From Swiss-Prot, chains C, D, G:
This is Flagellin B. It is found in: Secreted; Bacterial flagellum. Belongs to the bacterial flagellin family. The gene is flaB. Heteromer of multiple flagellin subunits including FlaA, FlaB, FlaC, FlaD and FlaE. Signal peptide: none annotated. The lineage of its organism: Bacteria, Pseudomonadati, Pseudomonadota, Gammaproteobacteria, Vibrionales. The chain holds residues 1 to 54 of 376 of the full protein. V.cholerae is able to differentially regulate the flagellins within the flagellum maybe to produce flagella which are particularly suited for motility within a given environment. Flagellin is the subunit protein which polymerizes to form the filaments of bacterial flagella. FlaB is not essential for flagellar synthesis and motility.
Length: 269, 53, 54, 54, 53, 53, 54
């Protein structure tokens, strides 16, 4: 009978864990949609048809949506306990009839200022005009480390005669870890996210030395400024990392409450 | 958020009719069982009276 | 999933997407009568500004 | 075994599969209202990621 | 590409009405059978009381 | 302004049929349970009468 | 073929070729009005330059 009471309490606690996970993911569904709309706005702003005045029109809308992301992260609560603000940390849900049979749960901080919601950015210090084409030096290497802790060597052999904008497209196609773009002055920029790149990115090679690169500026969603074409081109990559962080976190919660789906049934038999 | 919050208070506060009716049927059968056993239990002193008196 | 009377999340979910569908129809029907995708700054802030100046 | 009143394990199996049926209908009702097999990572953790990317 | 990627997402995210309605009517019939058997199953203690009382 | 004021008045005054029908069905089901339980409730003093009365 | 509602790629194909047909008539009717095949470098950049020189 003590076991029967224990399982009765266990299924109640597990159902509470499902409710907490469901509430966190429910607010998370809108968090994804705001980022997708922000990526929509960033895509439109990067167009050259938008004048200076229009780029501000996106910027106020994106800033409002960024404020909305902070609102959802902070205000989302379950019984007065904030879930997506990062103050919840890790809680162990007791789903057993005896002490020490709990299972942990973690929800990362879903603020727009979270480190996982962005990455680092490297800017070419030399602008290339519309008439610049790659010469006899094309090799460009990027040496960094993945989140798994192993060194990754990524080599691009750019094709001669391609202007800077074609070069940005080619670097994007060749490798998925980094993302290339071009700003107002024609300065190639690389974005190394915070989930697939840890540590500084060592850019080298004949093309890398000629183009030149500076220190990595750490950026997040809250730093998105679509008032400039470089900011909007960069913003597309930032929210790609943000959506990746959100989606990878959602699949962690879905597998978590799926685990309760099997657990609650198991404790029933 | 409102819907999942409503689902949560359902999971704890809202009663389950399937279990409650089964439990309160066990309650009713106990009532008939207890009334019957009580009627049969008080005949023991009556048997004692008929033994001597 | 115990049987429920007081709380009916199945109906609450059902009507929640009913509002989403109704709003989608209300926006679409407005665009058909007027003939404009951008009838307000709600639809596209950038599109409204560029179309207004054009 | 024996006849008894205290336990109703046979009824417990009947109500246990009632949650199975109620849950099964609850997922289906959500899927028909929205029109999406995927409303959360519950149904497909991997399918949700690829659909969002698409 | 937009049309083809839209069709691909349909095969992964979009629901099949032909499959979902059949599975939902399966769940509806399941609970009616479960409630029916549950109603008849709670009478087991009632049989016990009628055996003695 | 007339259309927008009418829309705002709608969000405050006009009733939500989707919510209200569910509310009234919940009320109908709730009282059906209340009346049913009321019928069984008054049989408790009847069990008192049938106990030994 | 899963008979869904949110995705209607059959109509997307129809309106994709509808736009192609709309493009087809618009250039043809413009050519009829002006009386020239090459009303723009869109049609034939080669023909536009040689016709301009001629």
């Amino acid at each position: 009978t003590s076991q029967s009471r224990g399982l009765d309490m266990a299924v109640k606690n597990a159902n509470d864990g499902i409710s907490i996970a469901q509430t966190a993911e429910g607010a998370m569904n809108e968090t994804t949609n705001i980022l997708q709309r922000m990526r929509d706005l960033a895509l439109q702003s990067s167009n050259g048809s938008n004048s200076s005045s229009e780029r501000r029109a996106i910027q106020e809308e994106v800033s409002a949506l960024n404020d909305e992301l902070n609102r959802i992260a902070e205000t989302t609560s379950f019984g007065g306990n904030k879930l997506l603000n990062g103050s919840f940390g890790s809680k162990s849900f007791q789903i057993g009839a005896d002490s020490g049979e709990a299972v942990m749960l973690s929800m990362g901080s879903m603020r727009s200022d979270t480190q996982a919601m962005g990455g680092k950015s490297y800017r070419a210090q030399e602008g290339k005009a519309a008439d610049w084409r790659v010469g006899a030096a094309t090799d460009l290497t990027l040496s960094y480390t993945n989140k798994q802790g192993e060194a990754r060597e990524v080599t691009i052999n750019a094709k001669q005669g391609d202007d800077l904008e074609e070069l940005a497209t080619y670097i994007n196609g060749q490798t998925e870890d980094v993302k290339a773009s071009v700003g107002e002055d024609g300065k190639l920029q690389l974005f190394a996210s915070s989930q697939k790149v840890n540590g500084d990115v060592t850019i080298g090679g004949g093309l890398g030395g000629e183009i030149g690169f500076d220190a990595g500026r750490n950026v997040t969603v809250a730093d998105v400024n679509v008032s400039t074409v470089a900011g909007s081109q960069e913003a597309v990559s930032i929210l790609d990392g943000a959506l990746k962080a959100v989606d990878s976190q959602r699949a962690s919660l879905g597998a978590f409450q799926n685990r309760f789906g099997h657990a609650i049934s198991n404790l029933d038999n | 958020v409102n819907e999942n919050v409503n689902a949560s208070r359902s999971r704890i506060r809202d009663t389950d009719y399937a279990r409650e009716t089964t439990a309160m049927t066990k309650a009713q059968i106990l009532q008939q069982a207890s009334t019957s056993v009580l009627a049969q239990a008080k005949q023991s002193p009556s048997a004692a009276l008929s033994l001597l008196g | 999933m115990a049987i429920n009377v007081n709380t009916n999340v199945s109906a609450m979910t059902a009507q929640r997407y009913l509002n989403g569908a109704a709003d989608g129809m209300q926006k679409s029907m407005e665009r058909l009568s007027s003939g404009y995708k951008i009838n307000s700054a709600r639809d596209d802030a950038a599109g409204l500004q560029i179309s207004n100046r054009l």
